[PDB]
Amino acid sequence: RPWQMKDLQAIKQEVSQAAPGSPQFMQTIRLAVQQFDPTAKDLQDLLQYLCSSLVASLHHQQLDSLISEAETRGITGYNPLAGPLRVQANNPQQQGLRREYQQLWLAAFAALP
């Protein structure tokens, strides 16, 4: 049950005025992420739709650092012999990795301003 075009259109329109990482944007994006239960691929699509290449790159770097610390510590469900967290989160049998990816994503995007 992935999102459709209308959901993305509403998500972008409702937060057109606000700035990335504002409390309003964080509310709406967090609700979307917690409601649709998407993988990393869909999150990348959503970010490309919402913010430009500059904000995309900044979030990419911040999320790289956050994932770096998180999975360098060691995580309950992460096994580094199978692939990067971006790929484990895309397997529907690793929901723990998917939820960790979602939370790192939202925190990284909130850490912009």
Numbering used by the authors: 13 to 125
Sentences from the paper on this structure:
The retroviral structural protein Gag forms the immature protein shell of nascent virus particles. All retroviral Gag proteins contain three canonical domains: matrix (MA), capsid (CA), consisting of independently folded N-terminal (CA-NTD) and C-terminal (CA-CTD) domains, and nucleocapsid (NC). During immature virus particle formation, these domains function in membrane binding, viral lattice self-assembly and viral genomic RNA (vgRNA) packaging, respectively. Our results show that HTLV-1 uses a distinct CA-NTD arrangement to form the immature Gag lattice and that, in contrast to other retroviral structures, the CA-NTD is the key determinant of immature HTLV-1 assembly.
To analyze the structure of immature HTLV-1 lattice interfaces in more detail, we engineered an HTLV-1 Gag truncation construct for bacterial expression, purification, in vitro assembly and analysis by cryo-ET. The MA126CANC tubes exhibited varying helical parameters. Tubes were sorted into nine groups and each group was processed separately by subtomogram averaging. The in vitro assembled tubes had the same arrangement of the CA-NTD layer as the full-length HTLV-1 Gag VLPs (Cα root-mean-square deviation (r.m.s.d.) = 1.2 Å), underscoring the biological relevance of our in vitro system. The CA-CTD layer in the tubular arrays was arranged in a similar way as in the VLPs produced from cells, also forming a layer of disconnected dimers. However, in this case, the qualitative difference between CA-NTD and CA-CTD was even more dramatic. The CA-CTD density in different individual tubes did not permit structural analysis other than coarse positioning of the CA-CTD dimer, as the CA-CTD layer was only visible at lower resolution (compare Fig. 2d and Extended Data Fig. 6d). Nevertheless, this allowed us to assess large-scale changes in the CA layer between the different tube geometries. Unlike the CA-NTD layer, the CA-CTD layer was observed to have larger movement of its domains. While the distance between the adjacent symmetry-independent CA-NTD trimers was nearly constant (42.1–42.6 Å), the distance between symmetry-independent CA-CTD dimers was skewed such that it was decreased in the direction of tube curvature (31.8 Å) and increased along the tube axis (35.6 Å).
